[PDB]
Design a protein around this ligand. Sequence first.
Ligand SMILES: Cc1nnc(SCC2=C(C(=O)O)N3C(=O)[C@@H](NC(=O)Cn4cnnn4)[C@H]3SC2)s1
Length: 490
Amino acid sequence: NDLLQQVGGVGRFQQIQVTLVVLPLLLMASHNTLQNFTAAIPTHHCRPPADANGLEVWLPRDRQGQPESCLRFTSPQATEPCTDGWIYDNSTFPSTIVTEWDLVCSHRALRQLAQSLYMVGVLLGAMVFGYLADRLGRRKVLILNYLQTAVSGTCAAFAPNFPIYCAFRLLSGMALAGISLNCMTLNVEWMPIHTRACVGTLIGYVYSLGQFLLAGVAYAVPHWRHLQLLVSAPFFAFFIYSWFFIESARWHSSSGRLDLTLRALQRVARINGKREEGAKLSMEVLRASLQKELTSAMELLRCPTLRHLFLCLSMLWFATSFAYYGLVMDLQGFGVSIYLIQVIFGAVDLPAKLVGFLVINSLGRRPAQMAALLLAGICILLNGVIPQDQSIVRTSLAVLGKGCLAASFNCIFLYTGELYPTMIRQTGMGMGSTMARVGSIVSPLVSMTAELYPSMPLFIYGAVPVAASAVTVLLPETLGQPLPDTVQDL
Ligand SMILES: Cc1nnc(SCC2=C(C(=O)O)N3C(=O)[C@@H](NC(=O)Cn4cnnn4)[C@H]3SC2)s1
């Protein structure tokens, strides 16, 4: 690390490359929560038979007096399945994947399946591009992922049928999971030790700012294709600017090529302008500097002490992500504009990050998790209880509960590293991030329980954070306590 200071700490290279590597995370939110728009559900009712010489004589009504989304009259007034398809409202959404290939009534769930698959890609991409980034390096893999996100995200916009769309969303989410992974690593291994913490919050705030981008881009371009394309097309640019990057000098050392560690540090010293210092640098200096440094997930499940942490922490991450996507993947039904709420959610995350930070230091870490979760679960239970007519009340509670889940994410990311000792911290935090994604796969699969009982997803998304708030009690406090190095510690 001292060397980094020798070649110029937080130098221009640390301004230029760090801006360019964080700029793609402005579209991560867009991609993850895109279907709220590209897969929005316009008011749909069945199409009559052309044989008929309006809708009054051929569509049954429900208790609201609106023409039914699943049936149509067999004779001009028995009801039948709608063989000629459906008529969708060309108002808010001119075309969506729900309108394009009919993901409605019987295929009501196929739209959630896509999100599940996208998120199956996001689970796989943390594993695949984690291993490939240790072998090929951070920069390469990032080059290949900016290419893959752009190609598969453009081929999703030009997919002729839903199965091919689901395959290209899985490839897009896999590349984006390797981007969200290796953007931090490449931005942490090039900046000094006391500024590492500032890189991880910058990344968290730039994701929150990407919601505002999604709301404005989807309002300007509602059609799903011109929307899926416009969110994916900047990744071609990303790709062409990622060549110019410099590969991690830490990766070089560990992997072995200490001799690249020399060039890497010397170029960065030429960009920072302190070339003389790097000039002083040599291989002889590198042998002694990283001498010490240069010189498994089954442990968690072998050590009873470390299991305790693991099984407790695994729920927290799971429950935080599961109820987050359970309350964010349904903009509709809040009684208000689906774009406006996307702006309000992004804007509640912001003070949430602070007020979360204040309670994290003043009352302690452990209290936070339970507080954030418990209130998140209570807010989401109240959404399933309170009637649809109270639009402003369910909007206010959902926005509070979503901000409490953003406050939980920050809290668990800090708290989990303080709970694990140095020998299993990075491994156990990577396994914690693996449980959140599992939570993102299972969340759309619980949205399909709306067909059983309309409020049953909101009851499961509200019960799981309340159950997880009691699991924070089973973990110790870590406010003002020093970072453990061994399993004996604590
Ligand atoms: C995208 C990011 N990827 N890492 C990040 S660290 C920064 C951080 C943020 C934050 O808002 O500050 N988070 C999200 O947006 C949540 N996670 C997800 O939406 C999905 N997820 C889970 N685990 N990783 N992503 C949490 S993960 C911790 S933000």
